[PDB]
């Protein structure tokens, strides 16, 4: 039982430090969205970035 | 061309160092507060994004 609670705990740490890496009301790793662009060139070219849900 | 009153090559000279004396302007700003986008006016966005951030 120390250990499940002790696992319960560190699965938990994980939820919230994955829910909470936000910048500008946006993340990469928290799974709200597929991809996110950027800016490449002068002419409205994106830079692709695939999201890898954590 | 050729008078004593109107002299509009003054004029021209006058607007180019009023230009070079405001890119000095922003220049010692950018340079005494260190901050590219010091206050709301350089840029509304990134200066908002940047104080809630």
């Known amino acids: 039982n120390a250990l499940k609670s002790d696992f319960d705990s560190l699965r938990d740490q994980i939820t ?6 936000k910048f500008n009301g946006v993340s990469i790793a928290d799974g709200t969205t597929t991809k996110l662009s950027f800016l490449a060139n002068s002419d409205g070219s994106a830079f692709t970035v695939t999201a890898k849900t954590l | 061309l050729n008078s ?23 220049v010692q700003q950018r340079i005494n ?8 006016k350089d840029n509304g966005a990134i200066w ?5 951030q």
């Open chain 2, 33 to 40: 507060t260190g901050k590219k986008i010091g206050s709301a």
């Open chain 2, 48 to 52: 908002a994004t940047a104080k809630n």
């Open chain 2, 4 to 26: 004593i009153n109107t002299n509009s090559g003054a004029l021209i000279a006058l607007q180019n160092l009023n230009s070079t004396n405001a890119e000095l302007t922003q």
């Open chain 1, 16 to 21: 919230k430090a994955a829910s909470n890496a």
